[PDB]
Structures are given as structure tokens and as C-alpha cells.
Paper text:
The anaphase-promoting complex/cyclosome (APC/C) is a large multimeric cullin-RING E3 ubiquitin ligase that functions to regulate cell cycle transitions by ubiquitinating specific cell cycle regulatory proteins and targeting them for proteolysis by the ubiquitin-proteasome system. Only four subunits are directly involved in catalyzing protein ubiquitination (the cullin subunit Apc2 and the RING subunit Apc11) and degron recognition [coactivator subunits (either Cdc20 or Cdh1) and Apc10]. The remaining 85% of the APC/C mass corresponds to scaffolding subunits, of which seven are large multiple repeat motif proteins (Apc1 and Apc3–Apc8). Seeking to obtain insights into these structures at atomic resolution and to assist in the interpretation of cryo-EM reconstructions of the APC/C complex, we determined the crystal structures of full-length Apc4 and the N-terminal domain of Apc5 (Apc5N).
Author numbering: 2 to 280, 309 to 416, 443 to 452, 511 to 614, 628 to 740
The structure:
């Protein structure tokens, strides 16, 4: 009676990751076969299926929904790469390699939109609408993915989302963390934890980065909570936002320049292959090649030259011009020092990079001069065989350091991009480390990324929250640890053990709306034990110091499991005692607060039951 059944489907293969789209009623899931599939809310209809291929990663470990729900990113542990693809088309729009194999993923965006941040968004929105679009790259067989192909609305304006800073944070099996702005610019590489990145959470204010890690040991892994001080990204937020944005533009270009140079080099290889296939003398020439065959070779060489000329006079000229534009502005920012210097922006490094772009466009101009001088001799040769002219006929019978200038250019651009990631990564300190518990024999049954502990941001009160199960201490109790984003702040009820009731045992719990959490429970009745409902977190927090104690009395050098005896116990009550029950063996949920949707995955059976909370 409380919630409405929308669909019920038995998935062919087991599911290792479940996630809802933040803006649409779509659910992304990993199929344990390494395939990622999309499903609609109504009757859980399969939208698409992305097969796992050896070419672009086989083992996919996690997913991430971009706040602007048009782009979906997923990490591959085997090939050590993150591939960003559209939600409508299976095709990948972007890809990048990672230092360590992926463990977990998070795609978040800043909740702060104060004064100068608003002035920046408006400026970037007006910059992109004013600056002329780059010339359309021709549809070539050598051109892979074809993002710059220009068909209706371009994918480059989709890849680069809103000016509002969104970060894609990646976790490793070693504990290494990587933060990618707009899901493409590396802001920080953090290596301050010990286990394998189980859960990741960057705060909306960018003050802290909480992480839950599963440390592998001889008998059973040890679940440990950590909190990192990423406050530099908070203090210099409008600068970090603008800085990363210009780097995503310089990353889009250079790649555009390389792809256009690839199309230019391939068109040159098409002339040399056709020339090699073509080339007493009077009889042999007319027998080897017909008079009709010279005409088809004439157009093929003329069309390839025109495209080569267009690629360097239009694509390369506008490409380098836009590169000179975005770098020149980055220097103007870099010249502040008070701002951008403690962020790692070196004016001299980019100044030298401008000259590198200038030397490249000039060397490309010098390369065209060689092609034009070579084509004028061929023009006199072609017209002579059909019917200044005689001189060019005699003279008739990568290169010119272009590979060197492109490498020197991308070398200085990369030094401009790498310096901030090194110094921002140096600024972040490990301020909190809380060993929780050691995994039980039963917890090793379900996948890492579906089960509890559950890390969430709580953007309303700015609190890093964790809901975990310590089975060795208690079988029916759910533990809730909440720490503020600003570490200097002292929180009231830092840790509690909530007994949920009756409904007794809590299997899975997930954040839904402002103060309420969705919860899957195990009732006293034996036939139908599995039942889902929403719980109000307001009942336990108490927001007042009890006997001048904020539960800071526990030893953070010893596991919290060891000191469970003196933990502050609480008893929470449900909105409906017997809300929605199901004949299936539930155990897990995936929810979306604003879209009022839910996805109940069955324990091991991988049968899914969807319900709308509206």
C-alpha cells in the first residue's frame, strides 16, 4: 500500500553495481560478465547493452552518473582506464589511462554558487556562445569515434558540461585517489590511505574527502574510514573552477590538432600508395596504365591535396588560434600570484607554451610550402602528359621536424597541466583515520560496491556520513558515523548504534531525501521476512551534548569493534511499521530522492523489483 510497483524483471546474469540517473528515470548496472547495461523505470526495459571487448577494457568494476545525466563514465580495472560515453549512444566520447586499477568511483558537483562563481558561469557561457566554432573535421575511415565530425549538435559541447565545477573522483586497489575536473582534468593525485578504495566521497563545499577502505589480510579484510583535508580546493574554489575549465578547453584542442594532423598525414599516405601502384617506354606506359586510369589518379591526388590544404589553412590555423587564445587568458590568470600561484599556475611555463604553439603553426606553414612546391611540378607533369612548364617537368624527376615541433608543443602544455595536480595533491593532508571493524564470513558473499558500509555527503548540513554493520558486535544493529566537512568544526552525535524496530534487523540502508533514508529490513515472521520502508533520521541525532560527551571518548588507534560495549545506543521508529513486504529475498536497494524512484535487487538471485515512492 505505501509504494507503487512499476516493474519486475529477472536479469540474465548477476549484478555487481547498481546506480540511478540523477535527472532521468534510468538505471545503469554492471552484468558481472563485464557488460554495462541501461534500463528504463517502466517494466525495467533494456535501453542498450555495451559488450565488453579486449580492445577497450573487459573488466568493468564501477559506474558514475554525471550530474548533467547525459554522460556516463565507468572504470576498467584490467586495462587501467576510465571511458566516458553518451547515455543515448553506446559510443565513447572520451578516455584516459589511470596510474592504478579502479576500485570505486564518484561523480559529484559543487552545491556552492556564491557571487563571483555566478559571474564566472555567465562569462564562460558568453565565451562559448561568442567564440566561433572550430572547422568541421571530414568523415574519414582513419577518424575514430568522430566527436569533431559535426552532425547537428556537437558532442564537444556535451563532454564539457556546465561551468559549475563537477569532479570525477577515482579510487584504487592500492588506496591511490585521483580527482578529475569535468571528468577530464586531473586536479589531484592523493595517496594517503592504506587499504583498497571501497567508498569515496568528495564534499559539495570541497573542504574534505572521506574514504572507506578494505585492507586485505591473511584471514579477513579490515574496513577502515579515512577523511582528507582538501580545503585548498574550497578556499580557492572560483579560481580552481576557472583554471580547470581552461585546461579542459586546451585538452579538447591539441587533441583536435593531433586528429587533424592525423587526417592530413593519412591523406598524404593515400597519395604515396597510389604513386607506388603506378610508378620501349612508349609501349610499356600505355600497357601498364590506360589513358582512363591517369584521369582517375589525377582527381584522387587533386582531392587529397585540397583536403590537406584545407586541414592546414582552416583546421590547423583556427586550432592554433584558439590554443593561443585559451593559453593567453590562462597567463593573465597565472600573473595574479595571490590567486593561481598556490594552485600551481606558472606564467613562464605557459608563456613558453605560447611560443611552442606559434612555432608549430609556423612549421606547419613551412610544411605546406613544401607540398605546394611539389604540387606545382606535378601540375606541369599532369598537363604535359595529357596534351615555367618545361622547367617544372625537368625538376620533377612527420617530415621537416613537424613531429619534433608537435612533441615540443605537447611537452610544455603537459608541464602546465601536470604542475597543479602535484602541488594540489601535496596540500591535502590525512586528518582523520578511524579503524572500524574486520569483515565476517557472511559479508564476503555479496559484491563490495552493493553492500553496506554506505558513504554519503548530506549537502544540507555538510556532513560525511557512514552507515555500517559490525556483525561481530551485533546482528540487528546498524551503526551511523557522521563527521563534518570542515574538520575544525566539532560535531554533536559523531557515532550512534541505531536499533530499528517489529522490523528488528537492517540489511541495506540508502540516502533518499534531506532527512530520510530508505531501509530494507528482516521482520520477525519467518515466511515473508524481507520488507522495505523509509526511516526518519531526526529521531536519533538529538542535536544536544549528553553529559558533555560528543562520543570522542573512543580510541581511534584501536578498531571501533573492540570498544562496541560503551557505544551510545538509540532506538529509532519507522513511518509505517509494516510498509511494503515482498515474497522475494531482497537485502539491497538503489534510490533517487528527487525522482522518487527505487530499485530492489534480490540477494544473489539478481531479480529486480522497482517501486515509485510518489
Amino acid at each position: 500500500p505505501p509504494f507503487r510497483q512499476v516493474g519486475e524483471k529477472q536479469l540474465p546474469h548477476e549484478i555487481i553495481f547498481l546506480a540511478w540517473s540523477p535527472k532521468r528515470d534510468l538505471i545503469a548496472l554492471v552484468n558481472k560478465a563485464g557488460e554495462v547495461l541501461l534500463h528504463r523505470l517502466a517494466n525495467i526495459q533494456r535501453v542498450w547493452s555495451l559488450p565488453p571487448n579486449e580492445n577497450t577494457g573487459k573488466e568493468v568494476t564501477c559506474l558514475a552518473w554525471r550530474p548533467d545525466g547525459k554522460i556516463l563514465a565507468f572504470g576498467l580495472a584490467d586495462t587501467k582506464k576510465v571511458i566516458l560515453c553518451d547515455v543515448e549512444k553506446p559510443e565513447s566520447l572520451h578516455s584516459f589511462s589511470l596510474e592504478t586499477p579502479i576500485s570505486c568511483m564518484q561523480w559529484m558537483e559543487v552545491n556552492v554558487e556564491n557571487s563571483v562563481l555566478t559571474s564566472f558561469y555567465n562569462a564562460e557561457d558568453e565565451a562559448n556562445v561568442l567564440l566561433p566554432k572550430l572547422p568541421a573535421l571530414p568523415k574519414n575511415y582513419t577518424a575514430t569515434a568522430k566527436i569533431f565530425s559535426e552532425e547537428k549538435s556537437d558532442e564537444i559541447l556535451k563532454l564539457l558540461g556546465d561551468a559549475r565545477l563537477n569532479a570525477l573522483v577515482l579510487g584504487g586497489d592500492s588506496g591511490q585517489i585521483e580527482i578529475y575536473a569535468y571528468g577530464m582534468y586531473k586536479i589531484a593525485t592523493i595517496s594517503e590511505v592504506y587499504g583498497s578504495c571501497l567508498r569515496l566521497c568528495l564534499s559539495s563545499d570541497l573542504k574534505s574527502l572521506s574514504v572507506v577502505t578494505e585492507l586485505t589480510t591473511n584471514n579477513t579484510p579490515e574496513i577502515t574510514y579515512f577523511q582528507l583535508d582538501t580545503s585548498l580546493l574550497s578556499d580557492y574554489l572560483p579560481e580552481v573552477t576557472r583554471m580547470a575549465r581552461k585546461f579542459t578547453h586546451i585538452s579538447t584542442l591539441l587533441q583536435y590538432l593531433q586528429l587533424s594532423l592525423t587526417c592530413m598525414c593519412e591523406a598524404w599516405e593515400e597519395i604515396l600508395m597510389q604513386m607506388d601502384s603506378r610508378l620501349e617506354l612508349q609501349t610499356l606506359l600505355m600497357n601498364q596504365l590506360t589513358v582512363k586510369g591517369l584521369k582517375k589518379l589525377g582527381q584522387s591526388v587533386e582531392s587529397s591535396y585540397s583536403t590537406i590544404q584545407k586541414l592546414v589553412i582552416s583546421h590547423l590555423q583556427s586550432g592554433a588560434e584558439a590554443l593561443l587564445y585559451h593559453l593567453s587568458e590562462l597567463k593573465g590568470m597565472a600573473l595574479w600570484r595571490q590567486k593561481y600561484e598556490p594552485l600551481g599556475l606558472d606564467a613562464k611555463a605557459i608563456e613558453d607554451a605560447i611560443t611552442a604553439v606559434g612555432s608549430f603553426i609556423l612549421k606547419a606553414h613551412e610544411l605546406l610550402q613544401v607540398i605546394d612546391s611539389g604540387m606545382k611540378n606535378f601540375k606541369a607533369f599532369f598537363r604535359w602528359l595529357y596534351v615555367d612548364f618545361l622547367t617544372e617537368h625537368f625538376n620533377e624527376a612527420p617530415e621537416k621536424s613537424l613531429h619534433f615541433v608537435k612533441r615540443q608543443m605537447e611537452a610544455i602544455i603537459d608541464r602546465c597541466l601536470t604542475k597543479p595536480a602535484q602541488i594540489i595533491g601535496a596540500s591535502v593532508q590525512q586528518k582523520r583515520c578511524l579503524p572500524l571493524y574486520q569483515v565476517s564470513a557472511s559479508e564476503e558473499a555479496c559484491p563490495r560496491l552493493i553492500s553496506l558500509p554506505y558513504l554519503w555527503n548530506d549537502k544540507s548540513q555538510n556532513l560525511h556520513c557512514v552507515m555500517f554493520r559490525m556483525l561481530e558486535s551485533s546482528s540487528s544493529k546498524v551503526f551511523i558515523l557522521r563527521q563534518p566537512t570542515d574538520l575544525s568544526r566539532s560535531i554533536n552525535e559523531a557515532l550512534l548504534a541505531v536499533t530499528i524496530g517489529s522490523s528488528y534487523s537492517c540489511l541495506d540502508a540508502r540516502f533518499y531525501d534531506e532527512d530520510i533514508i530508505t531501509v530494507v529490513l528482516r521482520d520477525n515472521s519467518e515466511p515473508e521476512g524481507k520488507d522495505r520502508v523509509l526511516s526518519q533520521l531526526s529521531l536519533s541525532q538529538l542535536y544536544s551534548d549528553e553529559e558533555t560527551e560528543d562520543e570522542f571518548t573512543w580510541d581511534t588507534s584501536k578498531r571501533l569493534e573492540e570498544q562496541h560495549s560503551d557505544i551510545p545506543t538509540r532506538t529509532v521508529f519507522l513511518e509505517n511499521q509494516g510498509r511494503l513486504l515482498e515474497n522475494m529475498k531482497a537485502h539491497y536497494v538503489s534510490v533517487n530522492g528527487i525522482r522518487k524512484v527505487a530499485c530492489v535487487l534480490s540477494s544473489n538471485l539478481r531479480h529486480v523489483r522497482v517501486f515509485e515512492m510518489d
